[PDB]
């Protein structure tokens, strides 16, 4: 579907996360939508890239693999379909017209309020020969956080994919060894998830203490 992804639904004015400190202002319903798919004439080389991609992949393979294309602030995001990620990445790296040699890493981002698409892995790719860059985005559910690892295509991802797992639990199936890299192997939970509490302690003061920022009010 072309409808945007709503990562959150703000209720009420002033960004209240709960009932709100003034009465009568909580009735607004503002969904938090990320940008939807760009219409078609993607700016700059983006079209030149995507068209080329659509050429190297078939119409059927391209349609099954690329879920969405989002140009935002002159940055091209290819919301790629899970499972098909290794094929698309191989096409990007190998194709002379794309030739995105440099995958700069993998970053997990958690959207608990995005149904069936809770965990997004972002792959910044750069083509040095063509002086281009794009960002693949693969969405996985929370209940099935498995994503295909790009190791065979981008070895640089091995540590990134590890950190992202450690921090989000995104299981990059096919990765040689998804061991926690930052946190201890015996650590419980995945800290960068929103469900994981900040785990701070109150700051002490003569006769008082300030609870961590995650407990106190916010807007």
């Amino acid at each position: 579907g072309d409808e945007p992804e709503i990562i959150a639904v703000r209720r009420g004015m002033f960004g209240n996360r709960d009932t709100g400190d003034t009465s009568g202002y909580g009735r607004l319903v503002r969904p938090v939508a990320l940008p939807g798919s760009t219409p078609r004439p993607y700016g700059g080389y983006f079209d030149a890239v995507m068209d080329r991609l659509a050429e190297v992949l078939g119409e059927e393979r391209y349609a099954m693999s690329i879920e969405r294309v989002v140009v935002y602030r002159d940055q091209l995001t290819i919301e790629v379909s899970r499972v098909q990620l290794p094929a698309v990445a191989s096409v990007l790296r190998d194709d002379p017209d794309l030739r995105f040699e440099l995958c700069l890493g993998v970053s997990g981002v958690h959207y608990p309020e995005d149904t069936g698409r809770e965990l997004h892995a972002v792959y910044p790719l750069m083509s040095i020969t063509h002086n281009r860059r794009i960002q693949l985005e693969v969405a996985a559910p929370d209940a099935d956080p498995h994503i295909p690892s790009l190791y065979a295509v981008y070895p640089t991802t091995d540590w990134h994919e590890r950190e992202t797992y450690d921090f989000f639990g995104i299981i990059f199936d096919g990765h040689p060894s998804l061991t926690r890299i930052e946190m201890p192997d015996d650590w419980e939970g995945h800290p960068q998830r929103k469900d994981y509490p900040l785990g701070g302690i109150p700051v002490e003061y003569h006769g008082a203490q300030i609870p961590p920022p995650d407990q106190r009010r916010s807007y």
């Binding site: 700051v203 002490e204 003061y205 003569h206 006769g207 008082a208 300030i210 961590p212 920022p213």
Partner: protein, 60 residues
């Protein structure tokens, strides 16, 4: 204290009154603590203060 990224300032306001006035106006900082084992010296507090009551000396 609002602006402090480190939660290194604790402020409790209280009323100025004729029998006891500490600052011009209706409010004053009765309690003012800085936890210097949390203060990172960023200076955001200073930029936050609207009265220049808070400044940063060069004493270190």
């Amino acid at each position: 204290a609002w602006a402090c990224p480190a939660d290194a300032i604790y402020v409790e306001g209280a009323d100025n009154t004729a029998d006891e006035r500490y600052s011009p106006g209706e409010r004053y900082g009765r309690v003012y603590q800085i936890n210097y084992l949390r203060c990172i010296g960023c200076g955001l507090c200073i930029e936050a203060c609207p009265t220049r009551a808070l400044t940063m000396t060069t004493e270190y």
